[PDB]
Amino acid sequence: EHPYGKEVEVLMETKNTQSPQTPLVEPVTERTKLQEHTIFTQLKKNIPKTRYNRDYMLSMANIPERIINVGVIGPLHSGKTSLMDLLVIDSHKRIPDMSKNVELGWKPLRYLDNLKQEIDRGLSIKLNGSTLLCTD
Amino acid sequence: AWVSAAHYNRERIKRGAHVEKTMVKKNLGRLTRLWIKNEQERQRQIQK
Amino acid sequence: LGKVSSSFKDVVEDYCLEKGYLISKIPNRYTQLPYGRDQDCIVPLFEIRNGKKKMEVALKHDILWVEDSSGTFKPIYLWALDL
Amino acid sequence: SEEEIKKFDSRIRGILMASGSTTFTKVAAKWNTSLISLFTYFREAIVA
Amino acid sequence: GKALNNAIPGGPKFEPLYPREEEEDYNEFNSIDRVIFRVPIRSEYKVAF
Amino acid sequence: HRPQLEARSGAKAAAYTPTGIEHARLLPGHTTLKYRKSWRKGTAFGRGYINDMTKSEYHQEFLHKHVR
Amino acid sequence: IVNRYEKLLSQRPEWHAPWKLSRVINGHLGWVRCVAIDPVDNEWFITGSNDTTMKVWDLATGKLKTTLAGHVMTVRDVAVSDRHPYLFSVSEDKTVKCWDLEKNQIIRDYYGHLSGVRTVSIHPTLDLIATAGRDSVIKLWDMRTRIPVITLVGHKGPINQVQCTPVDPQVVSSSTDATVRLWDVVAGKTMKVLTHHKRSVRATALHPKEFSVASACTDDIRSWGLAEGSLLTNFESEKTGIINTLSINQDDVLFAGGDNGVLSFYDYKSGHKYQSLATREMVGSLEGERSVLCSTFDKTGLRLITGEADKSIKIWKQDETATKESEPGLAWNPNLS
Amino acid sequence: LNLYDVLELPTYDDLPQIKRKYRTLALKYHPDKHHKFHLLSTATNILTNADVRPHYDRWRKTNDIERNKLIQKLEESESSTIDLLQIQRHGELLRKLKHFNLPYGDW
RNA sequence: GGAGGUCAACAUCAAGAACUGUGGGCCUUUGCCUAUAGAACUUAUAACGAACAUGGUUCUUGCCUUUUACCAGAAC
Ligand SMILES: Nc1nc2c(ncn2[C@@H]2O[C@H](COP(=O)(O)OP(=O)(O)OP(=O)(O)O)[C@@H](O)[C@H]2O)c(=O)[nH]1
Ligand SMILES: [Mg+2]
Numbered sequence: 001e002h003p004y005g006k007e008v009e010v011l012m013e014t015k016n017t018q019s020p021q022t023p024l025v026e027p028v029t030e031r032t033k034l035q036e037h038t039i040f041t042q043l044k045k046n047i048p049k050t051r052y053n054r055d056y057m058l059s060m061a062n063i064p065e066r067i068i069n070v071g072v073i074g075p076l077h078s079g080k081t082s083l084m085d086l087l088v089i090d091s092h093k094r095i096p097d098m099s100k101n102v103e104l105g106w107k108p109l110r111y112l113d114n115l116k117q118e119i120d121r122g123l124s125i126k127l128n129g130s131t132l133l134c135t136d
Numbered sequence: 137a138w139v140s141a142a143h144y145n146r147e148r149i150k151r152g153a154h155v156e157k158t159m160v161k162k163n164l165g166r167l168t169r170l171w172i173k174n175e176q177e178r179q180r181q182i183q184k
Numbered sequence: 185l186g187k188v189s190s191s192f193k194d195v196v197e198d199y200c201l202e203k204g205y206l207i208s209k210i211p212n213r214y215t216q217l218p219y220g221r222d223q224d225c226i227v228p229l230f231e232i233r234n235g236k237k238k239m240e241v242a243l244k245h246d247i248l249w250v251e252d253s254s255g256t257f258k259p260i261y262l263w264a265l266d267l
Numbered sequence: 268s269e270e271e272i273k274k275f276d277s278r279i280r281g282i283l284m285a286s287g288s289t290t291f292t293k294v295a296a297k298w299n300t301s302l303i304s305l306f307t308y309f310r311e312a313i314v315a
Numbered sequence: 316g317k318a319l320n321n322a323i324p325g326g327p328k329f330e331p332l333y334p335r336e337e338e339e340d341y342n343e344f345n346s347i348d349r350v351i352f353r354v355p356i357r358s359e360y361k362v363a364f
Numbered sequence: 365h366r367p368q369l370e371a372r373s374g375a376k377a378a379a380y381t382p383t384g385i386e387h388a389r390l391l392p393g394h395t396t397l398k399y400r401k402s403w404r405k406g407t408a409f410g411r412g413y414i415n416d417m418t419k420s421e422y423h424q425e426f427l428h429k430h431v432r
Numbered sequence: 433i434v435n436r437y438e439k440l441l442s443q444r445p446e447w448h449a450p451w452k453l454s455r456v457i458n459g460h461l462g463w464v465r466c467v468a469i470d471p472v473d474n475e476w477f478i479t480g481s482n483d484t485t486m487k488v489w490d491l492a493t494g495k496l497k498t499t500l501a502g503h504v505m506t507v508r509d510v511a512v513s514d515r516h517p518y519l520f521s522v523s524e525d526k527t528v529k530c531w532d533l534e535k536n537q538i539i540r541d542y543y544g545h546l547s548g549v550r551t552v553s554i555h556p557t558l559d560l561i562a563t564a565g566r567d568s569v570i571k572l573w574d575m576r577t578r579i580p581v582i583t584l585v586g587h588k589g590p591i592n593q594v595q596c597t598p599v600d601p602q603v604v605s606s607s608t609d610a611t612v613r614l615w616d617v618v619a620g621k622t623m624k625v626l627t628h629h630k631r632s633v634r635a636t637a638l639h640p641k642e643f644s645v646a647s648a649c650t651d652d653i654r655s656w657g658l659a660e661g662s663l664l665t666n667f668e669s670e671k672t673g674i675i676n677t678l679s680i681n682q683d684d685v686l687f688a689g690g691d692n693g694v695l696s697f698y699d700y701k702s703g704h705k706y707q708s709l710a711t712r713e714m715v716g717s718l719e720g721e722r723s724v725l726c727s728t729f730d731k732t733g734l735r736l737i738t739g740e741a742d743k744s745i746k747i748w749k750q751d752e753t754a755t756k757e758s759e760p761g762l763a764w765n766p767n768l769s
Numbered sequence: 770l771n772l773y774d775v776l777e778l779p780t781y782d783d784l785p786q787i788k789r790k791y792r793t794l795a796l797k798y799h800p801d802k803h804h805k806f807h808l809l810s811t812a813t814n815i816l817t818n819a820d821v822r823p824h825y826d827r828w829r830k831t832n833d834i835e836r837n838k839l840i841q842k843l844e845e846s847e848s849s850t851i852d853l854l855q856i857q858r859h860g861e862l863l864r865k866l867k868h869f870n871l872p873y874g875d876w
Numbered sequence: 877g878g879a880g881g882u883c884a885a886c887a888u889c890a891a892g893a894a895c896u897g898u899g900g901g902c903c904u905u906u907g908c909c910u911a912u913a914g915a916a917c918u919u920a921u922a923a924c925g926a927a928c929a930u931g932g933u934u935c936u937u938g939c940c941u942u943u944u945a946c947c948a949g950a951a952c
């Protein structure tokens with residue numbers, strides 16, 4: 001204090017700030033990984049190819065009579081999500097998420113599931129849709 | 137350094153975790169030295 | 185003070201009645217509160233109108249807090265309220 | 268009281284560190300004395 | 316079971332994984348006066364949810 | 365016949381022939397680098413950093429306790 | 433030879449500004465032996481100690497971020513890497529430990545010194561380490577595989593201070609045999625020897641630009657051109673001994689830490705000494721404990737950080753008023769040598 | 770790429786020095802003996818006249834700009850680092866009256 | 877030419893839910909946008925193995941004279 005007294009800050013440090021686990025040099029993550037929270041495709045080139053030509057679909061949007069909104073509801077494990085699965089994998093030509101396993105599947109490809117918590121929990125939680133054109 | 141080792145080993149024995157047979161004896165020695173130093177300090181400072 | 189049966193809020197209500205201002209709960213909104221401690225309380229707030237003026241008050245401890253213009257609540261004297 | 272629990276434990280550790288080769292019989296008396304002393308002073312309390 | 320240091324009545328017993336429970340924080344929050352003791356909140360529930 | 369008076373020059377060890385024993389701690393590990401980017405009255409009475417180890421306050425706490 | 437003495441009276445060197453004491457940080461239990469600074473962001477220190485720890489201080493506020501233990505004895509030297517997120521610390525326990533700054537845990541141990549290792553320097557472009565100590569040899573470690581690839585036999589005594597440079601001589605070394613060697617590592621033998629010092633050369637520093645080195649001794653701080661290995665200049669020093677450390681600002685200021693506690697600042701070009709300070713020991717310290725064990729400048733060079741033997745780190749700031757009103761220091765009188 | 774970088778040479782040279790630089794380079798990288806020289810010819814064109822050489826060099830500096838940025842960051846960092854009781858009490862009194870029921874004063 | 881082999885070599889096998897090639901436009905090769913062709917093996921109660929061992933360093937313990945040999949948890 002008085003040995004310096006004026007400008008000099010005498011600070012006596014014990015304990016710590018910055019709990020020890022902190023990186024102290026921040027790891028540089030170039031890409032942004034969503035895989036932790038959800039599982040979701042982030043590129044224009046990896047979106048599946050929709051055999052029916054999406055462009056032609058968007059044209060239907062001009063005609064209000066043409067498009068329809070169907071919701072799908074029912075009790076636990078009635079097969080809702082796995083039904084949407086049938087629709088989707090019928091529509092899209094090549095899905096990157098299909099394992100050889102679920103393609104011939106023993107294991108249901110659950111496509112509209114999409115959330116980590118909904119994958120592990122085995123259930124469906126937040127509602128998720130899709131839009132596609134299909135021939136009557 | 138010596139003193140700080142004495143503190144550290146003592147507070148390691150208070151928890152009572154794998155202290156060697158001798159380290160107990162030695163640590164005792166360092167503590168008695170330190171304690172007598174505190175005593176003589178107190179007495180001198182009472183004289184002055 | 186613990187002995188005293190009556191609760192402040194009551195006092196505030198009484199005061200409001202004389203004024204003729206009306207105090208309403210407002211369910212969702214809340215404001216962080218700064219009180220002596222280096223910590224901020226969270227309290228629900230209510231709005232009082234003389235005719236069609238709405239101002240919001242949150243009371244913690246035994247005090248009335250009214251927000252400063254830029255933002256953040258300031259404690260004020262009960263007599264010190266006129267809308 | 269916690270302290271005298273720790274005193275007991277520390278004493279057993281005493282018999283252990285010290286009785287490297289003091290024979291079984293010598294150890295047993297030492298073990299008993301601490302135990303008899305601990306219970307008798309607290310007789311009642313130890314149960315809880 | 317392991318991370319939370321519990322056991323399923325037929326399951327294995329491990330070490331704590333977080334050895335220090337000892338730190339306790341005192342605040343009006345969980346005070347007895349404000350709690351309703353209904354149902355025991357027994358151990359099997361902790362592993363399920 | 366006691367103490368060091370010198371140290372051993374690594375130069376000597378530099379000229380010897382290697383043995384080739386395989387140690388446990390030279391087994392490959394971390395093999396990839398990383399690059400950066402009224403009652404009261406009647407009574408008789410009643411109404412800071414030194415740099416040193418021994419004379420500090422913590423020390424007198426310590427010995428004040430452990431010596432009982 | 434007087435012609436030289438006239439040619440010393442023409443120059444009138446290089447004004448600079450004085451220094452003063454900004455901040456005092458206590459908080460080590462033992463002495464502070466070494467200090468290094470984050471070479472990228474200037475956000476912190478790593479300071480060795482005599483208590484075995486290393487305490488990472490924030491440069492801005494001086495608060496203590498974290499503590500890195502892991503050595504059993506005093507830590508003579510610490511060096512942080514540019515290209516890597518690594519911190520190489522080295523001690524008197526015969527071991528050179530790597531540290532991964534990301535997770536703050538020891539990654540690698542390099543093995544093979546006979547005795548205490550007092551210097552680490554991280555080669556700029558090669559992913560090497562250079563370590564040295566009382567072995568009296570310099571060990572060039574391959575950073576990845578922990579193989580002591582090259583060994584440089586040479587000095588006849590302990591090796592105090594070691595540095596690394598991208599072109600030739602890639603290793604400069606200084607020993608208690610009072611020499612400074614300029615090494616050629618590929619061939620693995622001395623490229624040049626500089627004998628001009630009279631006693632142990634206890635400190636060196638590389639000029640961040642001019643490609644030269646400043647060497648020290650008891651009373652005489654010289655400079656040396658690398659490449660050719662010429663002498664460049666001398667520095668005016670009456671007895672300052674002992675010089676524990678040197679540091680070179682980007683402005684061509686050359687710091688010299690004393691064991692008498694005097695902080696002797698120089699101009700690097702000239703050799704002139706424009707300032708000398710004396711530190712205040714401490715509240716309860718001894719007049720013996722006043723000295724300067726290490727020092728460095730931040731990446732800017734407008735701050736100075738000196739670990740002292742009184743168990744404190746001090747941060748010396750350059751005065752902004754200054755100019756010609758009253759800066760002037762000892763004012764350039766070249767006495768006869 | 771700088772003109773100095775193109776010639777692979779180091780950075781107040783005189784008109785004479787400018788000529789000598791070209792001569793030295795010519796000996797080393799003689800095109801008739803071994804596109805780069807296009808740069809040399811142009812820079813030499815201005816460098817051979819001391820005026821152009823000086824003006825051209827007039828307009829490392831940028832990097833100094835980096836130093837300025839660092840300094841600004843440091844300045845920002847270090848400097849920055851370096852009634853209620855009465856009110857609640859009055860309210861407490863006010864409630865006491867309400868409890869006691871004594872008529873309130875016109876506050 | 878077809879079937880095989882307790883044959884070999886060389887590739888590849890843990891990641892923006894993620895591959896490669898090609899056409900065109902902008903910057904000035906990289907990179908961004910747009911168009912097109914083909915994607916073996918391994919992955920969602922996540923992985924090459926529907927199986928399951930050991931070692932090193934660093935912490936926390938446990939046995940407890942000390943070292944190997946160890947007790948049982950974690951991170952790398
Ligand atoms: N036998 C049989 N089982 C089915 C059939 N469809 C689905 N399941 C099983 O029943 C479970 C429910 O199927 P999902 O469609 O994934 O569940 P869900 O319809 O999303 O139920 P929610 O999550 O509540 O919407 C799955 O685990 C399927 O394995 C079916 O057609 N036949
Ligand atoms: Mg579902």
Ligand SMILES: [Mg+2]
Nearest residue numbers: 158941942943
């Ligand atoms: Mg022995």
